[PDB]
Amino acid sequence: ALTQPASVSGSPGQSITISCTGTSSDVGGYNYVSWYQQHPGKAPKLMIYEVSNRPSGVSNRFSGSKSGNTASLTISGLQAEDEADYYCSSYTSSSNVVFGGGTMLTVLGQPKAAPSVTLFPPSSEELQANKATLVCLISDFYPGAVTVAWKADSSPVKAGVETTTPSKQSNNKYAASSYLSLTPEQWKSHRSYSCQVTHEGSTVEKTVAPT
Amino acid sequence: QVQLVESGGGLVKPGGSLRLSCAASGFTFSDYYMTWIRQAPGKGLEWVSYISSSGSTIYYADSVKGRFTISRDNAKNSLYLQMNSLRAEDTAVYYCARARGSSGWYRIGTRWGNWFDPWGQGTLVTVSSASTKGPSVFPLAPALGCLVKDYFPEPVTVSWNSGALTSGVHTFPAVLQSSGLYSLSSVVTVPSSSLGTQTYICNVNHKPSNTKVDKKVEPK
Amino acid sequence: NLCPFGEVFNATRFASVYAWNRKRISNCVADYSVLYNSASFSTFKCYGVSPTKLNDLCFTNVYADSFVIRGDEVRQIAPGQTGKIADYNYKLPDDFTGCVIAWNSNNLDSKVGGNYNYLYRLFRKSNLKPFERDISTEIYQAGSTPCNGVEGFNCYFPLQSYGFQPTNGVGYQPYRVVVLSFELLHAPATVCGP
Ligand SMILES: *[C@@H]1O[C@H](CO)[C@@H](O)[C@H](O)[C@H]1NC(C)=O
């Protein structure tokens, strides 16, 4: 219900501000505005309370301010580890707490990184269960946009592909995975199988063979 | 030392009821306001409700009012959320959190009980008419891994040697198939010298189906 | 049939000054040696009669008022004092006949995240009369601009939290105060010594 920008971005070392707009009945009515940061797969962490108080241990780069019906969280000296989601909350005239929609903060200028591809063939047990799955694991790559292509021997495959969306890791890079599901007949019937991942205008290829 | 562990999540059909609990350690539970906050997958934080020390001061969010009941047992150090008439829009991670400051003895203490620390890990609640499946667990032999295949719903938890092996483990996010079922892979990159002598056990737990599998992964 | 002082002094939780607790003690024999022959207390100043001789006196009722304040403000718990606590929270009369007992409770009433369960009144349109209790949370009008139940500039919530933390200085640490009031009114003596 409190309005936040969906995303913001700054360059490292600069100062950056995140606004949180409410009404007379919440941020403008009380001095009880809290800020939380959330990293992927972790619970939120309180950074600011009572508009401007910082708990002990939180970096001094974080500070909170209020003016009118808009609270602000400001980060001095951006660092790559500040890239996370940020949420504002405040106490209401009805004695509720409402949060804002959240803000994904991006830190620019981080180095590009090539993906680490790791392709696996079907297991012996899974083939004894008359199914075949080839597993392609892509990790430690940045920016987070890749294209996955499957090549049966040297010809493209479009059937039996399910690929994930890229997900952010703790080190600010991205991971993803693609799956090719095939018959045991089709697995044993071909020379090779290929998972090749194209990331920022270059390609990585891994190939797997029946054995 | 301070610890907040919430349980009771899983699969529930539309219109069903589910009860979440949160067990507290390391602080005098009786003195604080306790909250439930929830977060839909890919979505923002949404405050749900909070309760005072006696249980006589309760506030709910509008989205949740008339359907959820918050309650507390101070002797057992536990917080509960009773959810009723669930709809799919209630699918979310439910976090249990404590007000950083103790202000629970008063109805007025909501003023000083509205910033939260610590939080629990959260519990996934899925409201779906589909039925729980359970995974098939296969080894990914030579980097070693486990393919946890065709389960529903989320989440699945993977660990290695009962979670004594952390160094070099990356559990990948699951994939949603056109079936509507989930699969994930967990990889551990290990030294090639330890590839034949060391023992590598992959532990898979899928609570919605009560599925606990241990698979040993060895080279072929 | 002994007078239940333990319930007041040994309570797990104390009241806030602005909503100070009062306990009426009546129809019992009061062993005053339990309180006064103790090494617990950090402040023990009687004003009407001496505590040693307490057992030889006799009263209609005795009133045990209890609350928590800062160390700095224990001085204000005395006849003819002024200040935030004396004027707005708890006022004793100039003809006070009783005892003020106070002790440091940092181990009980301070928490690392802040203990906000103890409040006080910092704004009020007039000074309290002796032994008045004000529990109102009406928004305080501090200027000419009126507050129609809404908080803003010059319109303040009248109550504030101490936020007691363990790291505070002794003057800022919580103290539990019990004030004993001995009234001998038009009625018979219903509380007495052994
Ligand atoms: C309240 O506390 C102690 C606890 O052991 C009890 O023995 C005592 O008699 C009581 N009264 C006091 C301390 O005045």
Numbering used by the authors:
A (entry chain L): 3 to 9, 11 to 27, 27A, 27B, 27C, 28 to 95, 95A, 96 to 210
B (entry chain H): 1 to 52, 52A, 53 to 82, 82A, 82B, 82C, 83 to 100, 100A, ...
C (entry chain A): 334 to 527
Text of the article:
In contrast, CV07-270 (IC50 = 82.3 ng/mL) had only 2 SHMs (2/0), did not reduce ACE2 binding in our assay, and showed binding to smooth muscle tissue. The binding mode of CV07-250 to the RBD is unusual in that it is dominated by the light chain, whereas in CV07-270, the heavy chain dominates, as found frequently in other antibodies. Upon interaction with the RBD, CV07-250 has a buried surface area (BSA) of 399 Å2 and 559 Å2 on the heavy and light chains, respectively, compared with 714 Å2 and 111 Å2 in CV07-270. CV07-250 uses CDR H1, H3, L1, and L3 and framework region 3 (LFR3) for RBD interaction, whereas CV07-270 interacts with CDR H1, H3, L1, and L2. In contrast, the CV07-270 epitope only partially overlaps with the ACE2 binding site, and the antibody approaches the RBD from a different angle compared with CV07-250 and ACE2, explaining differences in ACE2 competition. Although CV07-250 and CV07-270 contact 25 epitope residues, only seven residues are shared (G446/G447/E484/G485/Q493/S494/Q498). Furthermore, CV07-270 binds to a similar epitope as the SARS-CoV-2-neutralizing antibody P2B-2F6 (Ju et al., 2020) with a similar angle of approach. In fact, 18 of 20 residues in the P2B-2F6 epitope overlap with the CV07-270 epitope, although CV07-270 and P2B-2F6 are encoded by different germline genes for the heavy and light chains. Thus, these two mAbs represent antibodies encoded by different germline genes that bind to the same epitope in the RBD with near-identical binding modes and approach angles. In contrast, the epitope of CV07-270 only partially overlaps with the ACE2 binding site and approaches the RBD ridge from a different angle. In line with these findings, competition of CV07-270 with ACE2 binding, as detected by ELISA, was very weak; therefore, its mechanism of virus neutralization remains elusive.
